RNA sequence: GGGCGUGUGGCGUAGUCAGCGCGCUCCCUUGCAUGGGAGAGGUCUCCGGUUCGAUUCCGGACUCGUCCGCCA
RNA sequence: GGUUGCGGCCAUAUCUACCAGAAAGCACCGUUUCCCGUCCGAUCAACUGUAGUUAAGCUGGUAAGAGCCUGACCGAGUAGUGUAGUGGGUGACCAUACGCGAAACUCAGGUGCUGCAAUCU
RNA sequence: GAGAACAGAAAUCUCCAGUAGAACAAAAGGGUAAAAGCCCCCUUGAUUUUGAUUUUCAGUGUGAAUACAAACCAUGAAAGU
RNA sequence: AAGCUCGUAUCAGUUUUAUGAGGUAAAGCGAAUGAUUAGAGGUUCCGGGGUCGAAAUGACCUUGACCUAUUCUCAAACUUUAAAUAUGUAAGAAGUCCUUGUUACUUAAUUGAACGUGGACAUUUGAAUGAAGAGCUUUUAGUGGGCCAUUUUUGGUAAGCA
């Protein structure tokens, strides 16, 4: 018959990695999570308690509950034609903070600093990001850079 | 070439007979292998040949391959 | 030819942690010590780290951060001459005095010393520093004995007893103290008090000085050089205890020099690395030497 | 439980079955198709272990038949008196509840105990009734 | 050079394999106990072998470990039993050496008719000072190459002390 | 073609991850009848795996004996 | 800058073979009355810091060293791949257009950094 | 790998090398080295009370599991589990 | 189908930026597991066949193993490495910063946790593009035999086959 267990098809997903097996380092236990933090989920195969299901591997969610050794995380799961709210109790070995959130907060504080310093002059702050604009005019010189003519190479076996 | 051309009839599909630019069953070219074997940095094996490298311990590189260091 | 390791072995080998390779840290014990209840968010957990080397006892109060461990206060056994203890700097009572010193020092620098005076009149009874009402809780600290063996009579528990009588709230039971009867599950207080005041070394001093005098000159030579007899060590432990309860303030040494003054001599004495060009010159000379037909 | 179900096709020769609430041991099995379209029927010929009677039953192959639990146990004789054997278990337990065999097995066992061999007795349990089937002699540990 | 490179006997281990449990085992254990002055330890069988007749875990051998000058004294008695002649094959690559002897009568216990006759295996383990580095729990390390005991050093020590000669084979 | 069972000393076979009995060959004892004790005799069909260990647990292969292979 | 205690990252830190180590600190080291544990005070426990030693541990250096780490316009815009055609070819498969882009190999360099407290010519 | 009477291919003892090439009840795959393996000591948390959550999923049931709360316990020096 | 609450948004089968997760394609085997071709150098208290040897833990060849350095070819249920395409989250007003209130939680401790009071920051309010209105509810029909094409792919010699 068919087989769809709780950890089916999780072979390479829950292998550890090359040459970093063994016990886990103490930074994962010394990291501090608060309610509202945004965290990434990546399971550790060395810890069998508090494991996430294989669906939530690589998923990103929001902390809603902090307990003794675990963290409650909220994920949005697509079920059919809508998203449902899923609450997960995961031990802290299987989560880490999302770095995109802290990058955005750094942008927020630097952006507020720019607005605060330029408010003393009113110099059209222009605080929105802009994407890659087309590159403008330039003059390239041939002083020591005379062009070299290239041609297609004929065919050879090369074995 | 005639032996390979006779052997090609026993195979399905299309095969080509190409005269390689390499020396024997090695992977260097003919003048590259010639300018390598004029120095002592090649040394024969049962059918193949072992080559000298600039890496490794100098004691092993001198017990093997003596004629190149005999400069 | 026999003790040879392949390149495949050395490529697939995974090294342990550096402290495990040095054999100094039990990470299985460290994880259970330094981790915190996550609902106590940034609350530090404090370890009384007690380590026994030859000729020293090291007591520290240590919390853990990601960038490394942080020490509130440390107390070594080699600063006991300031309090009047000159000989036996690693005996069970020296461990007691070091624990008492680090307890009084931490409560002084935290300001929790006018309350929680600890056990002023010591008798060898088993009790913990209980919380006084309508005030702050006592300072809570946990042992880190490291790789040292737990054993009834070991002096890590003497350091524990000294720190507990100094006013720290350290959780412990009494079944590892000297004087614990195994069959009758109770603690004998007078033998523990004798050990606090050095009875086990003074009784040996008497029972070896009465018969074997060459041993009494080989060991306990410093006791004869400083005329310390068997009965006076009890009162010098008492005077050391009251000197600790007077001032644990930890004046450091004067260092006799500067950091760069030590660094000049040690930088002169240390060996340096060989650069790439002189390494190439060395191997060219070696090729011209042995492979140059002698 | 004392007894457990099984399928007729799952049964095979030298196995135990329950026929008419008797522990029986099969000697013959034969399957014949009922009709060309239909399923085959199993005809079972078996012998009761205790009484030796021959009992037969035919059933559908997919039908489930009852199967007993039969345990064979090894003991040493102590005495044969009044038709009741007295046996001795490993770890020194003793039972006298077993009745002596009544046939040529019982006669041979009685003569062997009279002339003084050390006799090893096999007694079987199935569905709450107890009997002795065979005896040997201990070649070593005399 | 040589401040504390001096070889010494780490231990002497005396092994008797009676091969089967019971009265012999107890008699061999009594012989080992009276010879050592210490109670001996019996060792269980790892696997069942029919040809030997052994099964798993019947304490088929008995052995004792003696350290110090007493071990040196029993080694003196064993060497005077062996007439201070040992094969070159007896020594090992690590530097440890052993020999096997028949009966304790040559050792001089004297004979009781009950206790029987049992031969012995003597094994001497040799080390230099500083061997605690491997044995201690904290900061366990490996011993350096120069300080290691070897076969040539142990045969030189066995020629110099005990004024004995080794056989060429 | 498919499925099931089958191989143990000459025979009957039994079995815990090779035993007896009757054969065989000797010896001993005592009829009316005997009986006892020794031996020679078994790659458990074969080959692997598993297991401390496999007759025993499994897989593959051989032999032999069975039972089906139907409606059009 | 050396050393110790507790660490963080967990080989640039490991492994092999040699060499060196002032001071201090670690270490080996001396002992079995007491607590305690062993067949064995070897490990563990306790005592002394006394009788000694850098021989080992430890630290550092060396090696056209093994390994590991970093980089390259080195291989290679190669292999692979998203999209397109009433493209080629009997087919197998393959070119082109708009895009993305490896691994092995080769070469060059490197061989622990650092936090808290104490202590040191 | 090198040794030690009987003792040899396999009995017990000693040393060295040994990233797991072993073991963890069973199928297979993950995980584990001062351990999750082997040995020893003490125990019954394989307990009570109802909730929440994950998988299968209709976000029903059943099975299995996760993290807590309120008790009462076990173990250890203790953190804890 | 009936609408209801609102009026340009608590949107989007899309892109960019930042940040995750994956073990396929490819590649690799002088890297682990497994398969596999060929010689070379060694090991015999440590193999087997011959010949010379009284025999010899004898010799000489040969052939097998094991080791060492090479060499040829591979893997759906092998792997150090590792794409492309797909895929999670974020790009603020429900935000940021400052100050200090509550608690029976928590801390050695106004230490922290959560929710707050008061104050400051507004149209470039925090990337692009588009918005066709956005959000919400009730009720009920039919359907629950499918098939084909490109690409990936399984069984099969194959099939207008499954």
UniProtKB/Swiss-Prot annotation, chain B:
GO terms for molecular function: structural constituent of ribosome. Changing residue 46 to D: In QSR1-1; synthetic lethal. Sequence repeats lie at residues 19-33, 52-68. It comes from the Eukaryota. The keyword Cytoplasm applies. Its main location: cytoplasm. Residues 19-68 are annotated as: 2 X 15-17 AA approximate repeats. GO terms for cellular component: cytoplasm; cytosol; cytosolic large ribosomal subunit. The modification Phosphoserine is found at residue 57. GO terms for biological process: cytoplasmic translation; ribosomal large subunit assembly; translation; translational termination. Keywords: Cytoplasm, Isopeptide bond, Phosphoprotein, Repeat, Ribonucleoprotein, Ribosomal protein, Ubl conjugation. It is found in: Cytoplasm. Component of the ribosome, a large ribonucleoprotein complex responsible for the synthesis of proteins in the cell. The small ribosomal subunit (SSU) binds messenger RNAs (mRNAs) and translates the encoded message by selecting cognate aminoacyl-transfer RNA (tRNA) molecules. The large subunit (LSU) contains the ribosomal catalytic site termed the peptidyl transferase center (PTC), which catalyzes the formation of peptide bonds, thereby polymerizing the amino acids delivered by tRNAs into a polypeptide chain. Belongs to the universal ribosomal protein uL16 family. This is Large ribosomal subunit protein uL16. It comes from Saccharomyces cerevisiae (strain ATCC 204508 / S288c) (Baker's yeast).
Swiss-Prot record, chain C:
GO terms for biological process: cytoplasmic translation; ribosomal large subunit assembly. It is found in: Cytoplasm; Nucleus. GO terms for molecular function: 5S rRNA binding; structural constituent of ribosome. CDD domains: Ribosomal_L18_L5e (cd00432). One of its GO terms (cellular component) is cytoplasm. Coiled coil: none annotated. The keyword Disulfide bond does not apply. The modification Phosphoserine is found at residues 164, 173, 232. InterPro entries: Rbsml_uL18_euk, Ribosomal_uL18_C_euk. Keywords: Cytoplasm, Isopeptide bond, Nucleus, Phosphoprotein, Ribonucleoprotein, Ribosomal protein, RNA-binding, rRNA-binding, Ubl conjugation. There is a cross-link at residue 161 (Glycyl lysine isopeptide (Lys-Gly) (interchain with G-Cter in ubiquitin)). It holds the Pfam family Ribosomal_L18_c. Disulfide bonds: none annotated. Component of the large ribosomal subunit (LSU). Mature yeast ribosomes consist of a small (40S) and a large (60S) subunit. The 40S small subunit contains 1 molecule of ribosomal RNA (18S rRNA) and 33 different proteins (encoded by 57 genes). The large 60S subunit contains 3 rRNA molecules (25S, 5.8S and 5S rRNA) and 46 different proteins (encoded by 81 genes). Component of a hexameric 5S RNP precursor complex, composed of 5S RNA, RRS1, RPF2, RPL5, RPL11A/RPL11B and SYO1; this complex acts as a precursor for ribosome assembly. Belongs to the universal ribosomal protein uL18 family. This is Large ribosomal subunit protein uL18. It comes from Saccharomyces cerevisiae (strain ATCC 204508 / S288c) (Baker's yeast).
Swiss-Prot record, chain D:
GO terms for cellular component: cytoplasm; cytosol; mitochondrion; perinuclear region of cytoplasm. Keywords: Acetylation, Cytoplasm, Elongation factor, Hypusine, Isopeptide bond, Phosphoprotein, Protein biosynthesis, RNA-binding, Ubl conjugation. It is found in: Cytoplasm. Changing residue 51 to I: Temperature-sensitive growth phenotype. Lethal. One of its GO terms (molecular function) is translation initiation factor activity. Induction: Expressed in aerobic conditions. This is Eukaryotic translation initiation factor 5A-1. It comes from Saccharomyces cerevisiae (strain ATCC 204508 / S288c).
Curated annotation (Swiss-Prot), chain E:
InterPro entries: Ribosomal_uL5 (IPR002132), Ribosomal_uL5_C (IPR031309), Ribosomal_uL5_CS (IPR020929), Ribosomal_uL5_dom_sf (IPR022803), Ribosomal_uL5_N (IPR031310). It comes from the Eukaryota. GO terms for molecular function: RNA binding; rRNA binding; structural constituent of ribosome. Its main location: cytoplasm. GO terms for biological process: cytoplasmic translation; ribosomal large subunit assembly; translation. The modification N6,N6,N6-trimethyllysine is found at residue 70. N-terminally acetylated by acetyltransferase NatA. It is found in: Cytoplasm; Nucleus. GO terms for cellular component: cytosol; cytosolic large ribosomal subunit; nucleus. Keywords: Acetylation, Cytoplasm, Methylation, Nucleus, Ribonucleoprotein, Ribosomal protein, RNA-binding, rRNA-binding. SUPFAM superfamilies: RL5-like (SSF55282). Belongs to the universal ribosomal protein uL5 family. Component of the large ribosomal subunit (LSU). Mature yeast ribosomes consist of a small (40S) and a large (60S) subunit. The 40S small subunit contains 1 molecule of ribosomal RNA (18S rRNA) and 33 different proteins (encoded by 57 genes). The large 60S subunit contains 3 rRNA molecules (25S, 5.8S and 5S rRNA) and 46 different proteins (encoded by 81 genes). Component of a hexameric 5S RNP precursor complex, composed of 5S RNA, RRS1, RPF2, RPL5, RPL11A/RPL11B and SYO1; this complex acts as a precursor for ribosome assembly. This is Large ribosomal subunit protein uL5A. It comes from Saccharomyces cerevisiae (strain ATCC 204508 / S288c).
